[PDB]
Design a protein around this ligand. Sequence first.
Ligand SMILES: O=C(Nc1ccc2c(c1)CNC2)c1cc(Br)cc2ccccc12
Lengths: 156, 39
Amino acid sequence: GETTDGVYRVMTRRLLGSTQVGVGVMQEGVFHTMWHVTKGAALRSGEGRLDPYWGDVKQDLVSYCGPWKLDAAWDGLSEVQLLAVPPGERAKNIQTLPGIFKTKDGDIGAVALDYPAGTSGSPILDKCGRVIGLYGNGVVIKNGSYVSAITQGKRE
Amino acid sequence: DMYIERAGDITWEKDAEVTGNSPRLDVALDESGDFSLVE
Ligand SMILES: O=C(Nc1ccc2c(c1)CNC2)c1cc(Br)cc2ccccc12
C-alpha cells in the first residue's frame, strides 16, 4: 500500500478502540520494527498486505516486505535524537546523549528516556538523519524509569 | 488484524528538546531477547 519512506504507527483493532502497539520505520520498501510489537504477524497498509521476511527474538527485530536496510551506527560520542511517536500524541524529536549497556558480548548504546510501552519501535537518529537503531527493548532501573538499548539490525 | 498509519518524516530537527541522562549499566541478554539488570 503506502510505501512512502518515513516513520509509521503500528495499530490494532483487536482491543477496545484503536490501540497503538508500537512504531516502525519504512525505508527502501521495507518496514523495520521491534519483534514484541507484531510478534511476526502480517500487517496491513491501507489495503496492502505486509508479510514478514526476517526476524530474531534475541535481537528483538523484524523486517517486512524485505531484508533489513537500516545500517547506521552510533559513533559513541555524539548526541542523538529519538523520533518519539507516543500513543495518541504527535511525533517529537527528543535530543539526548546516550549512556552505555555493558554486556558479555560487547557494549551497546543506551537512551535514558521515559516513554510508554506503545512507543516501541521509534527510530534513534543521528545528526545526518540516519536511523542508528530502535527504542523499545531495555531494562527497568532502580528509580522505576526505563533505559532502552540502541537496537540495530544487519544489512547485506 | 494489525495495520500501519504514517506518523511523519525521518529528519534531525535543530533547536529540539535536549533532555535525558547517560547511564553506564551492567546488563545480561537472555534467549527470550529480554535485558536484565545485573549487579
Ligand atoms: O514492554 C516493553 N518492552 C519489551 C516488552 C517485551 C519484550 C521486549 C521488550 C523484548 N522481549 C520481549 C517496554 C517498552 C517501553 Br518503550 C517502555 C516500557 C516501560 C515499562 C515496562 C516495559 C516497557
